[PDB]
């Protein structure tokens, strides 16, 4: 289209509204109620411009640019005097009841309302009457509520209800006593409730975890990092202050996680700030624990490892690609073991083979929202891959979007879209062992064991294409529902099949691959999505190695007399008794880790590794996208005794001291080159981010804002003399404000969004090519593998129907967003949020046991009798017992395992 703003001609997209079109061009219009992801509703009346009918028009008419289409030949004025006066009047009207709270408000220096009060040029108060007040609610451990600061812009309810699909946050009241929140005091029940701290343009919803240890945005040291809490790979901006990780902000990535995180990623960073973390290398001597520095630890470890006959390495899917590679180089390729179980590795390798050899395009997380039908097999996505559940909700609302687009309604006029699409939605069919959080929008939910879910998948695949193997023994009503799913998937233009390794079944992944292959054979634009478990599960699967059980056999038979365990607690992937026996048998255990794990009691040496906030590296997400995370701060800057290096740096210097008796603290890019030389499948991690020599017109990229304060008093209690600025040789960022963070800088890795005039998270509008689209100069991260030219074959291994036998209880996995990820469990704010561990029983099974809801039952697994209180699960099938995977004592390896001797305690 063509628009004329203030006498200047611009070419904009005609499907856009005027506000987003003018913001994409760089024109500043104040706005409150509009958000790029939520659409336009025209509530706050802040985006007013003057629209003229033609070129020779003088009167004009005040319109809302968010509700006005950017049609061809549209004449508007932003800086007209009447429009400026109206926008200042709207700011003043918002200011009449606003509290005098900015010094004691967590959004100060980060507030969109502050920025728009300054931007409209309103600074003189002529209102003299009383301000309306409100009482706050308790919204739980994560979100603090302060309703005085509300400007009644409806962003919270629109996000939480229309976008996020939550049900416990609404708008109550009337004329100007509108209230936003829950109907009663209680925890917000959404898994994406934490995005309210950035959706809300004021200080109503604030990060309570950040509020307990608060600092302003200009005092933060930010870095671009990848969330380490699950496999999706959402980009985050961790900000630190005084040596501790203070906040996780969302980092925009138009390909992956655009504006939104989940609550696990946003609030489960508190393990970094624990006081029991290793901070120096510790070597045991009898009963003593001697603290070493870096070089003494490397020399002693090199001597003992040189004397040992065979040293094996146990990696982890928590560690980065560089750290696992460095361990593999230290111990050798044949002595490197992926520190996960054999069944877990088999499911991970099958998921990898489906993704990079199945010939079906695996979509990015934002691309999920454009699919016309979703079949989720076995994966409880909301508790394991939550951002995919949010994207699936958007893809489900796509039918209302399509219906409104048929009636010539613009795609941003969201209220009319939801009016036209009342309850019509695209088909969603979820299968799980029990009820999911997607059941409120699913067209059908199948509560069944993993064998029965896999059989349903194979039956869908056979009914879509007869070349697929058939399933014998399908009930007629179940066959009718199979036919419903087949009619929905065959009529879809873009069907999506989501499975994962969290169901604990190989056959669920095989059935999902069969459905995707059958839909590909019919010519549909099908996509497949596997959900892995940990941050670098896909990278550890690509690198490969033996299972944890093989390494345990090597240690137990005596063939390995030295083990290096990298970032693996080893109890989540194998039985704790066997791990303890094998590690006590081994005459040398060396644990490179950043969290105090239980195996450190058996360790001869403990190397204090860095977490993601104190290390750089690369991780591979569930779609195969290599992503670089950068170090946020130097741990040695505030405490000089802290020796907390990267895991790859520890292992590389150990390898150097083992070979040549000299210590080599390498650089990150050297390790990257070594990975892309030794492992050709991981050759794409070179392009994930530029190297340390990258400059923006000669200067590095800044980790902290220009107004960073306290630079001559933040360490003045230790010494009045300022220390050296920490040198970053690994990456292209600098540990100071002496760098570049311009929005128009030719880079993809943005540590934080800030532009002059835009201090809020709405500053991301300046950093994108168009608002709500891709990041300017591309999103960071590259896909490792392309879609294969030819696909797999049909998996003919159809499992039998699940049969409950007496005295054997199949463990059904129940994942929790707060409590199934290990480092998240370590975060102290999740202790108040995670549920008490309940063992789920069918009513018939509990009646057979005589057990009621709440009586503690004991069960023996691996010769360990553990007791849990019983919760009655109606949707669970008989013969199965539900267990919370990942929590205290219950490892995720138990998913799908049998249970013996389940009696009342």
């Amino acid at each position: 289209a063509t628009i004329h703003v203030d006498g200047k001609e611009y070419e904009v997209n005609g499907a856009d509204n005027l506000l987003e079109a003018c913001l994409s061009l760089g024109l500043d219009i104040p706005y409150f109620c509009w958000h790029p992801a939520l659409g336009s509703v025209g509530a706050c009346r802040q985006c007013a411009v003057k629209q003229y009918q033609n070129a020779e028009d003088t009167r004009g008419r005040l319109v809302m640019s968010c509700m006005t289409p950017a049609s061809d030949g549209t004449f508007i004025s932003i800086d007209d005097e009447e429009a400026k006066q109206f926008r200042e009047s709207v700011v003043e009207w918002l200011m009449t009841n606003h509290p005098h709270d900015c010094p004691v408000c967590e959004e100060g220096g980060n507030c969109h309302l502050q920025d728009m009060t300054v931007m409209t040029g309103h600074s003189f108060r002529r209102y003299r009457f009383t301000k309306r007040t409100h009482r706050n609610q308790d919204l739980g451990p994560f979100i603090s509520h302060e309703m005085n600061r509300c400007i009644a812009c409806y962003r919270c309810v629109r996000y939480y209800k229309d976008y996020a699909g939550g049900t416990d946050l609404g708008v109550y009241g009337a004329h100007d006593n509108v209230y936003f929140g829950r109907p009663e005091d209680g925890t917000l029940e959404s898994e994406f409730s934490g995005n309210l701290v950035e959706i809300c343009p004021t200080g109503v919803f604030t990060d309570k975890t950040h509020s307990e240890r608060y600092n302003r945005k200009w005092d933060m040291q930010f870095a671009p990092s990848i969330c380490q809490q699950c496999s999706i790979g959402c980009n985050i901006s961790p900000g630190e202050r005084y040596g501790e990780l203070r906040r996780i902000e969302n980092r925009y990535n138009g390909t992956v996680n655009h504006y939104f995180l989940c609550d696990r990623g946003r609030f489960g960073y508190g393990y970094v700030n624990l006081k029991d973390r290793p901070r120096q290398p510790v070597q045991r001597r009898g009963d003593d624990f001697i603290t070493l520095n870096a070089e003494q630890a490397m020399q002693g470890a090199a001597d003992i490892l040189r004397q040992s006959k065979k040293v094996i390495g146990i990696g982890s899917p928590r560690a980065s690609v560089e750290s696992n590679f460095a361990l593999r180089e230290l111990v050798g390729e044949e002595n490197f073991y992926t520190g996960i179980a054999h069944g877990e590795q088999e499911r991970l390798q099958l998921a990898l083979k489906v993704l990079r050899e199945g010939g079906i395009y695996t979509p990015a997380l934002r691309e999920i929202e454009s699919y016309d039908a979703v079949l989720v097999l076995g994966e409880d996505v909301t508790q394991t891959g939550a951002r995919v559940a949010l994207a699936v909700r958007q893809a489900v609302k796509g039918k209302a979007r399509e219906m409104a687009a048929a009636q010539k309604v613009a795609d941003w006029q969201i209220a009319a879209i939801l009016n036209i699409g009342q309850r019509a939605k695209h088909p969603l069919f979820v299968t799980n062992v029990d009820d999911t959080r997607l059941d409120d929008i699913a067209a059908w939910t199948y509560r069944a064991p993993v064998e029965d879910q896999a059989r349903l998948g194979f039956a869908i695949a056979h009914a879509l294409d007869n070349s697929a193997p058939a399933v014998d023994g399908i009930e007629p009503e179940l066959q009718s529902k199979i036919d419903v799913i087949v009619q929905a998937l065959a009529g879809a233009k873009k069907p999506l099949i989501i499975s994962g390794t969290n169901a604990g079944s190989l056959e669920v992944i095989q059935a999902a691959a069969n459905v995707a292959k059958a839909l590909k054979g019919r010519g549909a634009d099908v996509g497949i999505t596997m959900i892995a478990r940990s941050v670098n599960s896909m990278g550890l699967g690509i690198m490969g190695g033996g299972s944890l059980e093989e390494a345990l056999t090597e240690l137990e038979t005596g063939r390995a007399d030295a083990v290096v365990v990298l970032e693996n607690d080893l109890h989540r992937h194998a039985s704790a008794t066997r791990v303890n026996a094998a590690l006590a048998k081994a005459p040398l255990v060396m644990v490179v880790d950043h969290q105090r794990t239980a195996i450190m009691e058996n360790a001869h040496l403990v190397l204090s590794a860095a977490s993601f906030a104190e290390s750089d590296g690369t991780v591979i997400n569930n779609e195969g996208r290599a992503q670089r995370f950068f170090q946020v701060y130097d741990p040695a800057y505030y405490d000089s005794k802290t020796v907390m290096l990267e895991s790859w740096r520890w292992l590389h210097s150990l390898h150097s001291t083992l070979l040549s008796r000299e210590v080599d603290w390498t650089q990150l890019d050297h390790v990257i080159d070594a990975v892309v030389a030794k492992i050709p499948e991981l050759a794409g991690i070179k392009d994930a981010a530029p190297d340390a020599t990258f400059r923006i017109r000669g200067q590095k990229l800044a980790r902290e804002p220009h107004r960073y304060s306290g630079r001559t008093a933040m360490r003045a209690n230790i010494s009045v003399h300022e220390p050296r600025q920490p040198q970053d040789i690994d990456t292209m960022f600098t540990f100071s404000m002496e760098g570049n963070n311009q929005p128009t800088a030719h880079r993809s890795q943005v540590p934080f969004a800030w532009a002059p005039g835009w201090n809020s998270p709405q500053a991301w509008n300046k950093f994108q090519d168009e608002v709500g689209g891709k990041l300017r100069f591309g999103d960071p991260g590259v896909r490792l593998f392309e879609t294969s030219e030819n696909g797999l074959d049909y998996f003919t291994s159809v499992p039998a129907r699940f049969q409950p036998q007496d005295g054997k209880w199949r463990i059904a996995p129940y994942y929790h967003l707060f409590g199934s990820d290990e480092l998240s469990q370590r975060a102290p704010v999740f202790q108040s949020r995670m549920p008490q561990p309940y063992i789920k029983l069918n009513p018939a099974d509990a009646a057979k046991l005589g057990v009621n809801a709440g009586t503690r039952v004991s069960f023996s697994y691996d010769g360990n009798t553990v007791t849990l209180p019983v919760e009655i699960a109606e949707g669970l099938t008989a013969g199965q017992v539900g267990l919370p995977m990942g929590m205290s004592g219950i490892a995720p390896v138990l998913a799908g395992a049998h249970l013996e001797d389940l009696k009342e305690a």
Partner: protein, 568 residues
Amino acid sequence: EPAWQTRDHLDDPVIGELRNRFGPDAFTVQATRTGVPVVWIKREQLLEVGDFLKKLPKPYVMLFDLHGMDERLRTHREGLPAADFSVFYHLISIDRNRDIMLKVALAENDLHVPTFTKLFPNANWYERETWDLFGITFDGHPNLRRIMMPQTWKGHPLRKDYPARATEFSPFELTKAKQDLEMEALTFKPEEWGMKFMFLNLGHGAFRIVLQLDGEEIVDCVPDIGYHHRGAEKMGERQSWHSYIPYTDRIEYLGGCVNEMPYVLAVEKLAGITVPDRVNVIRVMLSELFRINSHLLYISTFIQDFAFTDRQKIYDLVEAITGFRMHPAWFRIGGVAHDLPRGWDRLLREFLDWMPKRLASYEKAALQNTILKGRSQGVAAYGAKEALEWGTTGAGLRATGIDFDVRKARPYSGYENFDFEIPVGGGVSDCYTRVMLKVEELRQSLRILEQCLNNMPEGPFKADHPLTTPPPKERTLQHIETLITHFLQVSWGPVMPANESFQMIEATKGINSYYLTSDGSTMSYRTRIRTPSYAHLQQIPAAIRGSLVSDLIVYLGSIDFVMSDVDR
């Protein structure tokens, strides 16, 4: 029509003359808030344009400034030629009472400009400093060496990719610098310094001059400056618009509010702030108090080559108003920090009832002391031709008979409302003539203070503009809009929309000027400070040739320079 408005100056006759001479496509006119025509000239036509402007019917006779600029990070380059670097030449015509700024664009790899020292001899030090801080080579320059840095310095500190902060201190570099400086008197090379007879080093401020003597006659002298370089402009790029005012204070430290004035006027041009009349009167009053203080110190120092009680009276008055003696840091964007305290008029009235007798005593100590007349007249004198070509401003320029004062020619801060005379010398800049001009300027400043005291506006001390930084404190303490504005202005900084501004004022030593480039941010993209002590110190080797070393000492005492003003 506002005086801060973005103008193009296409109605300037110099633009039409340049169009008639070089053609309409030979240059690009830039619309700024500097108040002068900004003309982008091709690099090859630079000497032709300099020749043309030097030979106009009312010619441009003084190169006011010459400096570089790193354009690699400037995002708002609309209506500008494609430049990685630029060099701006600020030229002043006194007959027209106008000025022009010629900008030459440069690519990043081809950083060399023709020298301007054939047209304006004072361009020598400016081109040396532009080479030193930007790495811009000047072809044809005689000795293009570092003037603010030691010769063993790596990189150019005003480039955008240079770290502003102090690096780690090392005793090894200190010992190396001790070996370099302390072997200079033994291994002196008389060709690096531009010279070609004994060599002496001397060792207002502490600075070194390398002297070449025939007996006691000075046949060549090369000053060595940069020993007091504080990096004030690089700090201008590091502080916000508000939290840079103390740094403006700490340049020409005897000036104080005089040094604050051009910075805040340039920022107010950037912000579009027209300050009310009481603000203008307050800033004029404090600048005149500090001008009297500086003139008293200069006269007392020259008479030495009793007067320190009047300086204490001025310091007590400034202490009562601002809270601080010599670095008040009191002018704000759009006003001053506080209102005048209740009782200021009594202190000013007691000061103005004390000064006429002291001024009569100074005139008796300077006129009737005929020994000082004999030992001051004819001591390193120069005419108007030497004053124009070396950029000499202030008392020396007006002692050469050129009636050019900024407070009258280009009035600022409401100096039009005050009736005061401009003392003009006979046509020769002696030490004695400059001291007499300082005495008469002191009398005129006392007249300005009397006119301030008798007619004082009752009104606001801060403007009613949204970019007034900080807002008035009581409204900050009880209004949420004002609190928000205060919060964002003192933390992130006030946002000046992308423009270039220039303010030139009459300082206590000459003409001081700020040239600010904003890229639309809360900090300055470029801060250029032109100080008169730089141009006064460049003129010493042009005036002390063939004179005695005692004449050099008297001339140094009569220049009225400060070394922090030199090295800015």
